[PDB]
Amino acid sequence: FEGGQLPLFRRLPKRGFTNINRKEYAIVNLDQLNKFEDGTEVTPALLVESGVVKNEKSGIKILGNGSLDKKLTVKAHKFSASAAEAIDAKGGAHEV
Amino acid sequence: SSTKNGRDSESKRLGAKRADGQFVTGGSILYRQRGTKIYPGENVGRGGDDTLFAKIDGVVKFERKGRDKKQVSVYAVA
Amino acid sequence: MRVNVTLACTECGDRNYITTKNKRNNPERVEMKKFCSRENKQTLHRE
RNA sequence: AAGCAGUAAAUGUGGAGCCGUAGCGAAAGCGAGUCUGAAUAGGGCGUUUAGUAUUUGGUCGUAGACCCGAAACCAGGUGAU
RNA sequence: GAGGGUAGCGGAGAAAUUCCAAUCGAACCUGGAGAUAGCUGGUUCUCUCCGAAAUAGCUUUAGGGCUAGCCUCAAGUGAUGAUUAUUGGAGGUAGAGCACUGUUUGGACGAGCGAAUUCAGACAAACUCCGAAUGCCAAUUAAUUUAACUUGGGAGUCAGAACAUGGGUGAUAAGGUCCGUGUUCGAAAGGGAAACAGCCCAGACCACCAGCUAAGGUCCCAAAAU
RNA sequence: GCUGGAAGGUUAAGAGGAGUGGUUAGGCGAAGCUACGAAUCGAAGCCCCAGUAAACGGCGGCCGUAACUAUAACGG
RNA sequence: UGAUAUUGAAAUUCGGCUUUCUAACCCGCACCACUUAUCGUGGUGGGAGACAGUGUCAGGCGGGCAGUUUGACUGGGGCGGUCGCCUCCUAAAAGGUAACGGAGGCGCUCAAAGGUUCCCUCAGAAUGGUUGGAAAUCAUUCAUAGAGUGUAAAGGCAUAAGGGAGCUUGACUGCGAGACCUACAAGUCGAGCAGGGUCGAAAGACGGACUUAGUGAUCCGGUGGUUCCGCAUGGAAGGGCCAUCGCUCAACGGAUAAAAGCUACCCCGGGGAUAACAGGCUUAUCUCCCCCAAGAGUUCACAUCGACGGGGAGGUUUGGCACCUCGAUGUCGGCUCAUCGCAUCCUGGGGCUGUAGUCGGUCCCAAGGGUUGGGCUGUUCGCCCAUUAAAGCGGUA
RNA sequence: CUGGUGACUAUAGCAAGGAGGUCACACCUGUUCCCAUGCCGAACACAGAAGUUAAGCUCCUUAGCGACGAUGGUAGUCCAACUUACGUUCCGCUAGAGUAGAACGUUCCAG
């Protein structure tokens, strides 16, 4: 209440809408993959029980905010344009 | 038994905004006025509504320009 | 006596404008050469 | 957390769930970058990025909400000694 | 006189807002119910440190509320605060003046001759050829000083008063009223002005049967020079 | 305001189903199913036409002028 | 008041208002039985009849009844006036700053009155003229801008911002370092960069108009365009985004899509924050005294009277202010009992006279004591009748 | 003691009278040639034997009107004491007056 003057929210207009088919992903940067053995196979079923991903909302997406430091084979739903650039540069190969 | 007066408009804050010998930036307002009571000098521009602003960084200088006329200029600091 | 007028392109992409108009002084639609953002070139308008 | 076993003990089990580790956009989406834009040309918000659980104190919100006090309104009943 | 009838979103009225169990412009009892009250009143032990406001903007607003401005407590960033000397600038008030716009006294010269010619003398918040004293903005210039700023937690305040001074208003009336500037009261005891919140001097941590001063004073009440 | 009247104007549900869309068996697109529609037919009432004041209500102003010489019986 | 259900026949008729018939339905109509009661049921006659009555839907009338609204500022409140924006003065040479203080304007306009390039320069014109109540037009010199600048005013402009002549649409798209203003929301200026262009030989100028008023959140609805979403899937229906529109919402930061009066029949909560009576400050007005002396008075300003103008006292009149009292300070005129001031009505003592006497005029000193009874109006006042040595004027809530 | 082009508050102006040239500025006699007038080859630009210092233009003289003006007083005024209008201490007008003043002058072309 502003004592009679129009409130700020009444003065401002509404914006946007919501999507019913909103899909979200659990991001995992290239920094959280420095604990597994060299050449190991990383799968969402493992990341959810190893301690990296607490809740897989609608899939695991791998980003590239950092260096891998190991040669692994990763299995995920989506890969960043820079996540695969550095995963295939340290050896191994990714897959969807 | 009534008054015919009682109207007035909001006051505009005219006059100088920076002092002589002071350092300013490239887009600092220096003088707000109606018309041209002070003319621009070196590295100074006159706005649409007769506002005087600088164009470079330097010291401000209020000097005289002819008999009964004033200007403002800006010189780079060395 | 003045009115609001909107200028559309001539048989191309429509990038409109808004100006004023006097009915008596100009009793017919006017034409001008303005910028067409979509076409990226000068083009004649009307209305 | 509920539940289960326990002295109405407050322990042991229970990992659905919640917050954090990554933002940006109305959205599709992209991602240490993203939005706007013909154009990383410029600008906006981020890359500053430690958190989380319990609890003492201060203040706010929903409940009468620091205490006492109206002129009235509505509902169902009692009255022509 | 006795026995009966009409009941409150209703009855009765030879009509007065008249009566319905000693207050009827709408009876009484219980419940919703701790109705609502931007309005009054009240609100319980002790010390220590700091310490306001009575203003602006908006308001179905004017004795209410909200943000800003002044207070306090923490965590931070570092001369970025204040006064003075000096060198610079912006800005037309006091005074003055008649060169512009007006108003206006006394003469002289024939274009119809006291104000769009000339010689003298005056006037102005909305006249200015001129123009201070102060105040204001600056210079990581100099000396003396102690602040200032940012983030977060909690507030109160929106009824002000007199005196001096620059003005409007009124009548160059008011302990009148509305603005600029400083002080005091408000929230400040002590001494002086006989008594006397606002005037003059001066800011109470506590105790003493010590000394020097301020305003104002020294014949008696009554401390100090008949 | 009340009473009577009808020439026409205007006006609801309802009836009426032109015509325009979304779907697809085979830029078009027949059917079926669907979301909406127009011409026209629909009464009182109100605008209109009369009557009623012991119905509600209302019943003028400025000049000049004698056989009534101040006045104004009369006229504008 | 219409449509439709209850609700069926026959004929007239330029998917039908109307004469027409019994069978539904209706009858506080008659005679019978239950039953020596006519409330009710049933049966037989008569009347009426697909109307009426009843249900749903629709239109109109409807203070008979009900729920509510009816602004604020304000030298108390009403009535009058005012409410947003622009310019000037008050405003005390930075900026800012009040009053129901002193003056005006705005709710537009222009397709050239915009941009650009080149040129130009105004009022008034001591005189000459086809001589028309000196000023239309033309001619030559004085000409410090006294002219103009769409529209109020104030700052600016003859290096033009004023006038004319040529081509033009920059009155462009995507933005934008840094500043002014500022509680918020808003408002104002802006170099520079990329994409298009216009004018100019070229530098270069151009993101409307010499500058400052010509305007209004959001929510909801309409019209275009489009990257986007669209409930199981493919479409669609509906949403989002960009451009744009519709408000004297003028009480102009806009309560709701939709709103006026009376109370002497009145009620509650508050205020001396705010009126009516008395107190207080003030003295415009009021009452009573003075200064100047032009003139009235035969001559003679001053016996006495005193134009024009000027200076004071008093706190009894009508007001100004709003400082004490609204959990309460009772009015006007009397009656009864008084007190006190002196600006003296009577009585006492004195000047001067325009003082013969008897009677007066005016002024000074004097407050001891006195200072009537009735008629008319609620009164104060005021008039009247008859008297008196005299029938004084003021204060005390 | 020249022309061109800039810097500076008319102390640089306005007047009044005087002197000077055919090397330079001007005046000057022409409209076929590019271009130009809302009468005027008037201006603008042009095609260019002569004709002349009468004016434009200059260096020289004169303080008449304008312009620049200290010293000393006066008004006003910050601060502080009295008290309301008077003292004291800093600043310091306007007007008027003695007066300056008939320009100073960089680069530059050729003399």
Ligand SMILES: O=C1C=CN(c2c(F)cc(N3C[C@H](CNc4ccon4)OC3=O)c(F)c2F)CC1
């Ligand atoms: O025509 C008149 C109008 C009003 N008048 C008046 C009055 F006569 C007495 C008082 N007051 C108020 C105070 C409280 N008195 C009462 C009495 C009943 O309620 N309260 O005591 C007084 O003296 C007042 F203010 C007045 F305006 C005068 C007579």
